[PDB]
């Protein structure tokens, strides 16, 4: 999930909204240890949401 490639690069979402999409994905999975500034946890959450 922390790799060079990105899940959202295969979607129509603009790169300026990648953190918005990862916050949506993290909040949808009922995670509570998540902080907005932690990009790594956001990427892990969206990876487990799209590719469980």
């Amino acid at each position: 999930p922390q790799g060079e490639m990105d899940l959202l690069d295969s979607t129509r979402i603009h790169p300026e909204d990648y953190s918005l999409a990862r916050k949506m994905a993290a909040d949808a999975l009922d995670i509570e240890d998540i902080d907005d500034d932690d990009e790594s946890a956001m990427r892990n959450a969206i990876y487990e949401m799209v590719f469980p």
Binding site: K23, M24, D27, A28, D30, E32, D33, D35, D36
Partner: protein
């Protein structure tokens, strides 16, 4: 006791050698004929006075003797009549039969026998498994109260009931002075009986049976040995299997070895440990248990299960102490996912709201359980909301308001927890 040698001999057909149901059974290497038979490199040592070939003796370096294989004449460099032809030459030790108090006939040494010396070759009919089953059923129908079967190898047994030798009269001893061994003679397999120690004249010759009952009922052992297990059976044990349930025992860091050690140290030294039952907790075992930090999430799940199951004060004390030793953040996050706070609420309530103990000891417990609550990583009151343990903390600081260190620690704890939030968290449909 009076000799019963001839009387014992008349009870069965005496054999000088093992008889075979067929030529295929009992063959060495599962019948694979090793044409390159194992020839010892010993040089023949003929004593010119007695004309005896002393090669392959006890203190000689015969490889075949060490490997429990007998030299065969005409194949080995040791020559004929070497000192490793004990089975073939039938040079049995001198023995007598005497009537025992409870075991019937038994074998005694007519002379003093050296260590590792060959006593006697166990004789019988070599039979297959089906023949063994048929004979076993027939003898059980006959009501015979004596074992007469030995396992030559897998699927191949030796029967000593109707035909055999004096070795069938040897009685079981739980601390035996002799032992049975398996040897290779030519392309065949033999079962001999050898002296485990120095045995004096008149002493009974006994070996460990190591009985495979094949579902038969236990038979009580009357050997008289102090280390007797009391029954004939290839296995035996004490309460050294479980003292506490497996998830609860592994929650405390205890395993099969630690559950063995406590019972071995006390029960075998005249101190009482009850029969296996987890309804009553033995506090002394839990206090004496060793504690190591947790670094595995399955062990954390077992700890959570133990918290949800065990009601004992002392087990919970030692689990909380183990958690105090534990400092791995991932295990603590797993406990949070398992809602450890929910279990800790009940653990508190049972001890400091219900009062089955003393106020000083409960105070020590409370000081020993507030520390890891203060220490664990926390990022959101959603964690606590799954337990509402703060309410329990308020109730216990209100009850033990006289003990001001507990009150001040709970003040610090609620102050720390109240700073938490969840920034912005998207509401979900309901």
């Amino acid at each position: 006791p009076a000799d019963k040698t001839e009387e014992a001999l008349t009870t069965f057909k005496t054999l000088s050698q093992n008889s075979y149901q067929n030529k295929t059974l009992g063959n060495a290497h599962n019948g694979r004929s090793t044409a390159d038979g194992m020839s010892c490199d010993c040089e023949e040592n003929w004593d010119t006075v007695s004309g005896i070939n002393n090669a392959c003796g006890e203190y000689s370096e015969c490889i075949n003797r060490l490997t429990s294989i007998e030299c065969i004449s005409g194949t080995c460099s040791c020559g004929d009549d070497c000192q490793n032809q004990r089975f073939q030459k039938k040079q049995y030790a001198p023995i007598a039969v005497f009537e025992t108090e409870k075991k019937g006939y038994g074998v005694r040494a007519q002379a003093d026998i050296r260590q590792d010396a060959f006593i006697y070759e166990y004789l019988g009919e070599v039979i297959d498994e089906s023949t063994f089953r048929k004979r076993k059923e027939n003898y059980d129908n006959q009501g015979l109260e004596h074992f007469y079967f030995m396992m030559l190898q897998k699927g191949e047994f030796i029967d000593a009931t109707a035909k055999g030798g004096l070795g069938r009269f040897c009685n079981h001893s739980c601390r035996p002075n002799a032992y049975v061994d398996k040897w290779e003679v030519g392309n065949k397999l033999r079962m001999g009986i050898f002296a485990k120690r120095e045995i004096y004249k008149g002493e009974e010759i006994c070996f460990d049976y190591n009985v495979d009952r094949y579902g038969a009922n236990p038979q009580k052992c009357y050997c008289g040995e102090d280390n007797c297990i009391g029954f004939l059976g290839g296995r035996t044990q004490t309460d050294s299997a479980n003292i506490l349930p497996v998830p609860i025992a592994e929650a405390l860091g205890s395993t099969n070895a630690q559950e063995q050690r406590w019972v071995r140290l006390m029960k075998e030294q005249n101190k009482s440990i009850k029969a296996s039952d987890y309804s009553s907790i033995n506090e002394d075992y839990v206090n004496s248990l060793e504690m190591r930090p947790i670094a595995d999430k399955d062990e954390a799940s077992k700890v959570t299960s133990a918290l949800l199951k065990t009601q004992d004060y002392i087990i919970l004390r030692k689990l909380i102490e183990r958690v105090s030793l534990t400092k791995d953040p991932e295990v603590l996050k797993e406990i949070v996912r398992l809602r450890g706070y929910q279990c800790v609420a009940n653990i508190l309530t049972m001890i400091v709201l219900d009062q089955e103990q003393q106020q000083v000891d409960v105070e020590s417990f409370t000081l020993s359980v507030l520390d890891m609550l203060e220490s664990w990583p926390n990022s959101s009151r959603n964690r606590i909301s799954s337990s509402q343990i703060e309410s329990v903390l308020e109730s216990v600081k209100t009850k033990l308001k006289k003990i001001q260190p507990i009150g001040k620690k709970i003040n610090s704890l609620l102050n720390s927890w109240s700073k938490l939030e969840i920034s912005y968290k998207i509401p979900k449909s309901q």
